[PDB]
Write a protein that binds this ligand. Sequence first.
Ligand SMILES: CC1(N)CCN(c2cnc(-c3cccc(Cl)c3Cl)c(N)n2)CC1
Length: 485
Amino acid sequence: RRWFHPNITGVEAENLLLTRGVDGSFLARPSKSNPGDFTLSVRRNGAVTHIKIQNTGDYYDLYGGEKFATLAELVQYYMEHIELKYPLNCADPTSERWFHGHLSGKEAEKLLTEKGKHGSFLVRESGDFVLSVRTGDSKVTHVMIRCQELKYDVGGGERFDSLTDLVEHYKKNPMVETLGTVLQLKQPLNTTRINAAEIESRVRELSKLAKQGFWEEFETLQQQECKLLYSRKEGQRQENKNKNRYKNILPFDHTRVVLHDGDPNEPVSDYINANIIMPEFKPKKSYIATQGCLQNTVNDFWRMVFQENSRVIVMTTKEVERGKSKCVKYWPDEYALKEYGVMRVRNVKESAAHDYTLRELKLSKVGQGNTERTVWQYHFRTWPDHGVPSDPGGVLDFLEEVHHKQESIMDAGPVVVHCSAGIGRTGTFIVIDILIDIIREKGVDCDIDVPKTIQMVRSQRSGMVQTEAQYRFIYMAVQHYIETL
Ligand SMILES: CC1(N)CCN(c2cnc(-c3cccc(Cl)c3Cl)c(N)n2)CC1
């Protein structure tokens, strides 16, 4: 993911492509003219083209292109399909997990001693740098990194174009001390795990200017999304193409929900754009993250709910937003009964609350009375069209009610969560739910690691949690939950 430059202007991007690139060279960067937006800068016929990528929270929407779950998925699509031929690699180490810019040696030794383990390492500024590694069961070793005539070295041997190239080389070819100690660079020092009780302190520190600390942390998490390019073959099958709301936003094959007992006369009846999400990766405290139904996928949706024994559905979109259909109406009007293929649904009662509507549904298979179960649909109706709510209170009160409903039901299957694409708002609600559940069981004195949790959810469905605004909202929601305990 070296084609992503987090700190360059459009002029710097043009100058980089015109002087260090060739026709077909490209890079992506965050927008400066509209923070929250991105730009794909591409060299074609000796000139540079700047293409806008927008993300208001649901997907990356490339101008003159398609809608994607991650920037890595976007780039992989066009590199395997204006030509994107040559990534122009970024030498900036700001978004590396192990880079701690202006941090002192005293503080760095305190962090490796209190939070490190064998092979924990960090790189900090001295124009020179220091590589600090903990080894043992123990001790801290400091390796001086010289910057001489724009290249990096540890005092001998090879000279690197970037700290990234230097760190990767010494991860592959470890330094050995003359008495035998292997300076193993096993893992970056963990600085994001916090005690839940100290959430306020961390939010305060992250709200300070780095763009704030939140931006730096979120972009270091995005840098790791190239580790998550898992296969999505099933969603690409001709037979499944029109079952996807967005052509290129697909479920990973390894976690997709497989639909069994399909119409024997239907060649492909096992697909739905949905993934099982398991915390720390029981059916009960698991989730199904899915897209908003299409008219042709309503029956598949109900086959999924029935098969998985799901008793709670969380809908985080209106049916229509900004004049566009985000989810078809897959449930009957209040008091009505409808058949969706082999599935029969009665809408028993609707209850309106400030931020949401609850629909008590009875789902059963046609011809089998004894299969009836109640499915509780919580429909969050006040999420803004773009961005996130200004206050997490409403979302928390809603999740608290959803949690208690699910907890009250013996052997309930995973909670189904959906929005439009099923990755932005969906991923945001699931992550908040996972984090608050840890504070429920383990109490205020528990460890929480927001980016670790999100990377874990993102390994089960593409792009869960889309934006820096949602990333900050997750911290704000955890903070508010702890503050009202
Ligand atoms: C100051 C700095 N340059 C930015 C903040 N920082 C970190 C570190 N680690 C993560 C992390 C944690 C768990 C899983 C994943 Cl995948 C990630 Cl990437 C993160 N998001 N930010 C430290 C370096």
